[PDB]
Structures are given as C-alpha cells and as structure tokens.
Design a protein around this ligand. Structure first.
Ligand SMILES: O=C(O)CCC(=O)C(=O)O
Ligand code: NA
Ligand code: NI
Length: 356
C-alpha cells in the first residue's frame, strides 16, 4: 500500500482525524507508531453462564435456581455469558456477515455519512487531542439505536440496506433480551416495581447504542491495546464476538482473566450506573480487548442505558442497615454523562467520585 497512504496515515498532527488502523495494518510495518504504545496486572476460573430458557422457565424450581445463578454472577463477577437466549441464529449470522462485509468496504464507502461539527456518530475514533494521547489499535462504528428519535437519520440512510435492516432487527432483539435481564435482576434484588422506584422503569424507555469494534492484527501486540481498559458507563452491555478470535479480558482480583465466548452466546456485563442503582450490590468490572499478531477480531457491543432524564441513585429498598447507601443520588443520567466527559482524568474512577 502506497507511500502517499503511509504519509496520510502516519504524519499526524493534533486536531486531525484519528486514522484507520485497518488501513495502517495493510502497511505491515515492523514497528508500530509511537501513538499506539501503552504507558499493569498479571494474567490469571471462567465467567458464569446463564441460561435464558431456565431463567424464564414456567417451572419455579428451574427459574429459582437460574435466578440464584444470575444474582451470583452479577454480585461476584459483573460479567456472564447468556445461552439459549432466544435470538434467532439466522439473525446472529447476518449481524456477523453484514458487519464483516461493512468493514471490508473501502474507507470512502465506510465514511459516506457527513458529520456536522459535534456529530460524532458513525465510523471513526474521533480526533487527535495531543502528543500525549494513546490510540487504540482498533476502528469503530458507533451510533445510537434507541429511542428512534436518537437515530441519526442520514447515518442510517447511508448504511448498506442489508446491514441497516439487520441492525434494526438486532436492536429490537437486544432490547427485548436486556429487559428480560433487568426484570429478573429486579426480582433477584427483591425490588417491587409498584411500591418502589425500581430498575426496569429506568431502562424500558431508555437509550440504546451499538459500538462495532474492528481490531486488526498488530505486529507488536505486547505494546498496543485493542480497546483500553474501562468499565462500561451505563446499564447493561450485551456483546457479540463476531469471529472466533479471542481478545476480551476482565479485571478480577488484580489479574486479567480471558473471556472465551461460547459458540451460541452473548457476553453480558453490568455498567457503572447499574452498580449505582443496585447500591453497589452488582459490580461494574474493568475490561479490555487485546490484539494479536495474526488475526483480526470483530465484536459488537449493544449498550442499554437509562433515559437521558432519568434520575439516578441507589434504589431505596436496597438501602438498609446491612447495606447502607454508598452512592449519591439525584443527578440525571444525561448530566452524569456530561459531567464524566469534563471530569478530571487524574484521580478517582467515576464510581469512586459518586461515593457518599
Ligand atoms: O471487543 C470487546 O470484546 C469488548 C468491547 C467493549 O468492551 C466495549 O465496546 O465497551
Ligand atoms: Na431503604
Ligand atoms: Ni466495554
């Protein structure tokens, strides 16, 4: 791939668009550019598996055992796989093939959507902020998917039709599965939705977004990271690993644990806002995605978050003498999102900043 492309991809100033790593990987460089070098914990028992059919079983003994398993996973792990989840195999196959198809399109075709200033949705990691900034070894496509009025209509119109139709179907199925899980988590926590401002009501008309992740092979995989360590900010994340390449890791007791998605599974995790709503009973866990020297990895994360005007705090029935209130109450989700963006990166986590 030509000398001009190398120059366009590597001669970067602050304020320029973050370049495509899928394009950079075509150069097959010996050494990665300095911006991709990180500047840690050892490697490690595997994440629990929750069966959705068992969870929804009309047989109370089956349902109760699976509820106990869900409750355990949310408390002790913050991450679990879901199987027998009711999302049609043919839909999942289409999500995989259409997203694979999409990233294999040319840059021109992937960036057809024209962003007005402050429109950050669609393809792209954003802009280079400083020489200090570390870039992830990944390209993304990220957009809001619910409610309907948060969809960028021109972005959706410029997607390939089968991808768009598949994404719209997948949005609905992800939303349904998220509500199955929120409803059972409510039941596990013994929150009566009628008497109490609970959990499910916050999410039923909440926001949904998708982040499609493309992690190209990297010649120096022990210097770079696919996706920098983070906890997800919102409610429930439902992740599909698109191909059979491993890379997701979670931070457990000061060590990184690999997650290997089962063939017909999604990986589900608790976000920071859900930790707050549960008064710290369920845990939002730090995780990252690592790259490798030989194979690209793809994934799609679907985030299920409160409405922007939802008032956030620990659910009052989870505040007890045995579990006193750990977190502040009373900010809207949208204000927490904004405050976190303009927060100090030096010092504490978002969660630790919300502690009473
Ligand atoms: O690609 C992965 O396995 C992880 C994705 C992720 O953590 C995210 O999109 O928040
Ligand atoms: Na209480
Ligand atoms: Ni994540």
């Amino acid at each position: 791939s030509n000398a001009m492309e190398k120059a366009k991809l590597m001669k970067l100033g602050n304020g320029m668009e973050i370049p495509s790593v899928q394009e950079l990987a075509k150069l097959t460089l010996a050494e990665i550019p300095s911006r991709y070098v990180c500047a840690l914990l050892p490697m490690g028992e595997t994440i629990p598996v929750i069966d959705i059919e068992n969870l929804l079983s009309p047989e109370p003994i089956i349902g109760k055992l699976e509820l106990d398993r869900l409750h355990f996973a949310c408390k002790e792990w913050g991450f679990f796989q879901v199987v027998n989840h009711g999302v049609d195999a043919s839909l999942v196959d289409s999500v995989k093939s259409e997203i694979q198809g999409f990233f294999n399109l040319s840059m021109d075709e992937k960036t057809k959507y024209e962003q007005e200033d402050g429109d950050v949705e669609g393809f792209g990691q954003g802009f280079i902020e400083s020489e200090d900034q570390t870039l992830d070894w990944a390209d993304i496509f990220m957009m809001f998917t619910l409610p309907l009025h948060l969809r960028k209509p021109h972005l959706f119109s410029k997607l390939p039709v089968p991808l768009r139709e598949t994404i719209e179907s997948y949005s609905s199925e992800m939303k349904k599965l998220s509500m199955v899980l929120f409803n059972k988590m409510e039941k596990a926590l013994q929150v009566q939705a009628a008497e109490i401002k609970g959990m499910s009501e916050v999410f039923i008309d909440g926001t949904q977004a998708m982040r499609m992740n493309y992690y190209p092979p990297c010649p120096q995989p022990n210097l770079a990271i696919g996706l920098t360590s983070h906890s997800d900010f919102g409610g429930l994340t439902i992740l599909l690993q698109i191909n059979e390449v491993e890379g997701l890791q979670i931070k457990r007791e000061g060590t990184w644990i690999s997650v290997k998605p089962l063939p017909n599974a999604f990986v589900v995790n608790v976000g920071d806002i859900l930790e707050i709503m549960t008064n710290g009973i369920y845990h939002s866990v730090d995780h990252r995605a690592v790259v490798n020297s030989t194979n690209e990895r793809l994934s799609i994360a679907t985030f299920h978050d409160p409405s922007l005007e939802s008032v956030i705090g620990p659910i009052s029935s989870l505040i007890t003498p045995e579990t006193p209130a750990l977190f502040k109450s009373g900010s809207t989700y949208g204000d927490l999102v904004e405050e976190c963006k303009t927060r100090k990166l030096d010092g504490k986590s978002f969660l630790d900043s919300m502690r009473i």
